[PDB]
Amino acid sequence: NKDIYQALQQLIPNEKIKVDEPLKRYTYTKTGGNADFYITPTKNEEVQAVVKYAYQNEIPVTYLGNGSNIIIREGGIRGIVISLLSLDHIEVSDDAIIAGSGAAIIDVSRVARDYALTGLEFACGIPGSIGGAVYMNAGAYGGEVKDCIDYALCVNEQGSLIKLTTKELELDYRNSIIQKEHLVVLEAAFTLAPGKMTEIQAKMDDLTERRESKQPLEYPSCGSVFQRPPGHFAGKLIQDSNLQGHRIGGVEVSTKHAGFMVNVDNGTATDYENLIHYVQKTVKEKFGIELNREVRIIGEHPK
Numbered sequence: 001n002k003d004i005y006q007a008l009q010q011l012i013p014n015e016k017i018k019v020d021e022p023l024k025r026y027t028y029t030k031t032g033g034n035a036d037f038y039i040t041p042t043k044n045e046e047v048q049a050v051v052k053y054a055y056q057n058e059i060p061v062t063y064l065g066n067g068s069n070i071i072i073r074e075g076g077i078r079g080i081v082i083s084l085l086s087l088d089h090i091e092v093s094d095d096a097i098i099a100g101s102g103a104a105i106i107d108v109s110r111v112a113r114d115y116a117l118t119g120l121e122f123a124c125g126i127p128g129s130i131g132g133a134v135y136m137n138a139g140a141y142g143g144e145v146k147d148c149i150d151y152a153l154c155v156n157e158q159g160s161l162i163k164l165t166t167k168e169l170e171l172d173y174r175n176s177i178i179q180k181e182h183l184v185v186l187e188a189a190f191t192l193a194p195g196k197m198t199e200i201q202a203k204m205d206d207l208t209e210r211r212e213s214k215q216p217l218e219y220p221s222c223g224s225v226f227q228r229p230p231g232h233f234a235g236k237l238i239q240d241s242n243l244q245g246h247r248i249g250g251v252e253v254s255t256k257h258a259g260f261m262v263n264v265d266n267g268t269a270t271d272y273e274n275l276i277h278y279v280q281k282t283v284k285e286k287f288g289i290e291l292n293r294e295v296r297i298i299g300e301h302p303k
């Protein structure tokens with residue numbers, strides 16, 4: 001690894017490279033082992049240089065946002081982890097808004113309101129970054145990143161810049177082309193419609209109230225873990241299986257929303273995975289229905 005470190009240092013400012021860095025310090029779930037290399041670029045060129053280098057030497061690269069939609073094993077991640085959290089700009093021009101993939105979508109949603117632009121109120125409570133939102137076509141309460149996005153600037157695994165328009169992004173229900181061909185999102189552009197701020201505020205206020213009353217927003221958490229099985233709702237099945245409150249390590253099935261797994265007591269990525277297995281097993285026994293995992297689990301098992 002000496003070799004990679006030395007090489008990376010030839011390509012990007014040294015202080016932007018952290019070695020054997022515990023990811024639990026940065027993930028929304030507060031879990032995750034060591035990242036061999038944790039890079040925080042402040043420019044697109046730096047992302048390109050790192051991706052090209054990794055491609056050339058076959059080093060796996062993991063793109064990360066706020067970690068609100070993954071579970072990283074306690075063994076950490078082998079290779080290079082690029083955090084896009086510093087690519088945070090948000091700029092508005094009339095009805096258009098551009099934002100770096102590291103910017104919090106909630107921050108962009110709040111900028112939209114500041115300019116009396118309607119169309120992103122649905123995102124006032126979605127955790128994470130713009131890059132992650134694009135990756136999953138994040139959506140809530142009838143809204144989707146897809147409603148107002150024009151394009152997303154990305155870097156392919158070979159290190160080239162590619163501007164993908166709305167159609168090319170192939171935004172779908174909880175999916176996109178970012179997933180299918182491992183591109184890294186650098187920036188997203190939107191076009192919104194002028195609106196009446198008091199009305200924009202009222203919608204955000206209602207959606208905030210609604211979500212707060214239904215979700216365990218006060219605990220680090222991973223959101224909706226399972227796919228929805230035919231004829232039922234995963235959270236309802238889990239609840240009817242009397243799994244709410246069931247804990248393993250420091251992670252338990254939320255007593256506020258059975259579809260959520262909260263880190264209530266310094267839990268680990270291992271607890272999450274174990275609890276998932278246990279929930280799948282308990283439900284299958286009670287209803288004969290098999291819940292399939294929706295949230296990706298990455299990284300290595302410890303030891």
Ligand SMILES: Cc1cc2nc3c(=O)[nH]c(=O)nc-3n(C[C@H](O)[C@H](O)[C@H](O)COP(=O)(O)OP(=O)(O)OC[C@H]3O[C@@H](n4cnc5c(N)ncnc54)[C@H](O)[C@@H]3O)c2cc1C
Nearest residue numbers: 065066067068069128129131132133138139140184185223
């Ligand atoms: C309490 C709670 C409520 C939630 N509510 C909603 C909701 O209402 N609607 C909804 O859609 N989702 C929801 N989520 C899920 C989550 O917030 C979204 O999926 C979000 O867009 C993830 O952003 P992130 O920065 O946290 O991504 P991460 O968790 O850091 O990563 C997610 C995935 O995207 C990739 N990725 C991350 N950044 C980039 C990038 N720049 N380029 C390429 N790939 C990248 C990663 O490799 C990984 O596969 C909720 C989560 C929680 C904990």
